[PDB]
């Protein structure tokens, strides 16, 4: 049936974040007054962490594991859905319709998303999500 649910991982195909992997936080099938089309509120990774080896020290690993996130409202036609899933319970509250309207609650939302993504990547979950797409 419907696969564009919360927690679905997609690849952005248009815009500044083209080719980057996001996770859908809030779908909107019927649109709204702003963005009058089917769209989704997503959180993704702008700057992927670098690969680390056995020889890297603590400071180098800390530098190379940094993640810069972003939050975006994106049209459905500009998303390519995948078969992968990602838990969005940790930042479900901070990514909302009113987050984008107010400058700048986006900063707090991105801080929450950055902390969640970095903790999950350090835990070692969602290797495909945290791996950069090469094209």
């Amino acid at each position: 049936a419907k696969f564009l649910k919360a927690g679905k991982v997609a690849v952005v195909v248009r815009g500044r974040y083209a080719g980057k992997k996001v996770v859908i936080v809030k779908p909107h099938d019927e649109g709204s007054k702003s963005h009058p089309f089917g769209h989704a509120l997503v959180a993704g990774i702008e700057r992927y962490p670098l690969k680390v080896t056995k020889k890297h020290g603590a400071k180098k690993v800390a530098k190379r594991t940094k993640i810069k996130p972003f939050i975006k409202v994106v049209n459905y036609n500009h998303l390519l859905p995948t078969r992968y899933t990602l838990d969005v319970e940790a930042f479900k509250s901070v990514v909302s319709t009113e987050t984008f309207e107010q400058p700048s609650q986006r900063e707090e939302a991105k801080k929450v998303v950055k902390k969640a993504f970095e903790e999950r990547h350090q835990a070692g979950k969602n290797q495909w999500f945290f791996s950069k797409l090469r094209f």
Binding site: A58, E119, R120, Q122, A123, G124, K125
Partner: peptide
């Protein structure tokens, strides 16, 4: 603080 961070990461590995 570093030890506490390592403990938190290991707990997240267990529980996630």
């Amino acid at each position: 603080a570093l030890e506490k961070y390592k403990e938190r990461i290991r707990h997240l590995m267990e529980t996630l």
